[PDB]
Design a protein around this motif. Sequence first.
Motif, PDB file in Angstrom:
ATOM      1  N   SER A 124      17.254   1.211 -14.544  1.00 56.54           N
ATOM      2  CA  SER A 124      17.092   1.526 -15.965  1.00 56.54           C
ATOM      3  C   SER A 124      16.827   0.225 -16.776  1.00 56.54           C
ATOM      4  CB  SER A 124      18.283   2.309 -16.513  1.00 56.54           C
ATOM      5  OG  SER A 124      19.420   1.482 -16.665  1.00 56.54           O
ATOM      6  N   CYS A 132       8.545  -1.408 -12.351  1.00 57.64           N
ATOM      7  CA  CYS A 132       7.417  -0.518 -12.543  1.00 57.64           C
ATOM      8  C   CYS A 132       6.142  -1.328 -12.779  1.00 57.64           C
ATOM      9  CB  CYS A 132       7.691   0.452 -13.690  1.00 57.64           C
ATOM     10  SG  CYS A 132       6.310   1.559 -14.078  1.00 57.64           S
ATOM     11  N   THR A 214      22.701  10.503 -11.439  1.00 55.09           N
ATOM     12  CA  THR A 214      21.880   9.847 -12.460  1.00 55.09           C
ATOM     13  C   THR A 214      20.948   8.780 -11.810  1.00 55.09           C
ATOM     14  OG1 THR A 214      23.680  10.189 -14.083  1.00 55.09           O
ATOM     15  CG2 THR A 214      21.928   8.605 -14.693  1.00 55.09           C
ATOM     16  N   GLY A 217      17.848  10.257 -10.004  1.00 53.06           N
ATOM     17  CA  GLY A 217      16.850  10.668 -10.978  1.00 53.06           C
ATOM     18  C   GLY A 217      16.056   9.520 -11.575  1.00 53.06           C
ATOM     19  N   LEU A 218      16.717   8.374 -11.811  1.00 55.72           N
ATOM     20  CA  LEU A 218      16.063   7.176 -12.356  1.00 55.72           C
ATOM     21  C   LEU A 218      15.106   6.570 -11.311  1.00 55.72           C
ATOM     22  CD1 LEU A 218      19.094   5.385 -14.203  1.00 55.72           C
ATOM     23  CD2 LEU A 218      17.080   6.323 -15.348  1.00 55.72           C
ATOM     24  N   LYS A 220      13.549   8.303  -8.901  1.00 54.48           N
ATOM     25  CA  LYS A 220      12.417   9.221  -8.809  1.00 54.48           C
ATOM     26  C   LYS A 220      11.491   9.095 -10.014  1.00 54.48           C
ATOM     27  CE  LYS A 220      14.359  12.539  -5.602  1.00 54.48           C
ATOM     28  NZ  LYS A 220      14.869  13.924  -5.431  1.00 54.48           N
ATOM     29  N   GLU A 221      12.043   8.824 -11.224  1.00 55.55           N
ATOM     30  CA  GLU A 221      11.247   8.624 -12.444  1.00 55.55           C
ATOM     31  C   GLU A 221      10.385   7.367 -12.224  1.00 55.55           C
ATOM     32  OE1 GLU A 221      13.484   8.859 -16.444  1.00 55.55           O
ATOM     33  OE2 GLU A 221      15.085   9.520 -15.082  1.00 55.55           O
ATOM     34  N   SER A 224       7.508   7.952  -9.756  1.00 50.79           N
ATOM     35  CA  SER A 224       6.468   8.776 -10.342  1.00 50.79           C
ATOM     36  C   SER A 224       5.588   7.943 -11.277  1.00 50.79           C
ATOM     37  CB  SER A 224       7.097   9.931 -11.103  1.00 50.79           C
ATOM     38  OG  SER A 224       6.086  10.750 -11.655  1.00 50.79           O
ATOM     39  N   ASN A 225       6.208   7.007 -12.048  1.00 54.03           N
ATOM     40  CA  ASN A 225       5.483   6.145 -12.978  1.00 54.03           C
ATOM     41  C   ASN A 225       4.610   5.173 -12.217  1.00 54.03           C
ATOM     42  OD1 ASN A 225       6.435   7.065 -15.561  1.00 54.03           O
ATOM     43  ND2 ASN A 225       8.360   5.983 -15.184  1.00 54.03           N
TER      44      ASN A 225
END
Lengths: 245, 179
Positions: A124, A132, A214, A217-218, A220-221, A224-225
């Motif tokens: 995060s 990213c 949590t 999910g972060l 996987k986000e 995806s980005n």
Amino acid sequence: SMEMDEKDFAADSWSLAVDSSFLQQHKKEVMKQQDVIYELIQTELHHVRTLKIMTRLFRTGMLEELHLEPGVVQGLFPCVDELSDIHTRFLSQLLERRRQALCPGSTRNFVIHRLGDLLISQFSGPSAEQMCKTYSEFCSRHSKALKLYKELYARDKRFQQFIRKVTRPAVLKRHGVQECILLVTQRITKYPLLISRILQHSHGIEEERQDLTTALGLVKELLSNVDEGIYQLEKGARLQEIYNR
Amino acid sequence: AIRKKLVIVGDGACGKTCLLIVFSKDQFPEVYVPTVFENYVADIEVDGKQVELALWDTAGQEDYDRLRPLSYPDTDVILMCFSIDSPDSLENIPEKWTPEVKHFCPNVPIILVGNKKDLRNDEHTRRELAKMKQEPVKPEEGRDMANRIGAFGYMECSAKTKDGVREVFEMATRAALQA
Ligand SMILES: CN(C)C(=O)Cn1ncc2ccccc21
């Protein structure tokens, strides 16, 4: 990799790394949870070691021994310093959490109960923005790096001798230039598999089960980005090929 | 020893990670089965020819269509896997994995591999699949799918017992050496 860390992660599992008398003190579910956390840290240590082969052995060796054209070493190893900084800092935090958990009088007996918060922090804020940005750039330059390496190996005698010289020792068997690039590309997609299996054995403490849920999910986000920001660069490709993609 | 590259494709439930692990260690792990496989370079001698076969997994790349093809450059042989206890994994072979492998790896031999063959006669497996009006994949259904997708060959194995695992990788090496 430094000898201290190699020895701490030499065993095939956490159950084989700790003293057998310390292992006997834990319930089955804790041993299963600790075996997966140990696999995550040991593979992160190997990943950082792969990035050091790319920076110190390959990249630095070509700069100090060969006469290549400007921007060739950068093209072969895109974003290696930035990647090395992301994962050496993440490895530092994981090893510091293991160190604090060690029993007094021991350099191998530990139990990590609170991994979730560390994973939420890594995936995060600014550190996720940098992961990213860095993987989106590196993965988009993957095919250009491989094609450049093949051209150099086939047409430059001194480059071919260099590669044959530094990759000759048995410890470099799995770590040629192209193998290192794919090892790094594949690293990020290993995190959901490891986190999910850790979560499977972390129901004992509700807050830990929630923090890993949590963290998953972060991750996987992030993936995806990164996946959505990839477009293979091609040396010599014309603008027409690009806007007609 | 010539260098060849192998990549295994298939659904997450096909057991591709376990197959690569059991082959690379020549042992189904007794203490801990690893969640992930990094890479491996196996020394294989098939029919008198010595080869260094680099092994790669695609597990974790299934939902990422732009990251996944980065595993394919310069591949010499594809292992396309499905689980014998999962007819759904076999259904996904001809129109999801086969078109992708033929696009990114043109003219590369494909070996269709039926994993978990030990579950074909497992009672718990037969009871669970019967609830969804299904049954374990038959040997002839695997052969017909391999024929249909234009596979180099069809093979079966069990990573749990090691049966057929060595043969799969020795045949992959032979396929990688062909013109
Ligand atoms: C019409 N096109 C683009 C194709 O036939 C190529 N193709 N086939 C499978 C596949 C997967 C990802 C990217 C392109 C892929």
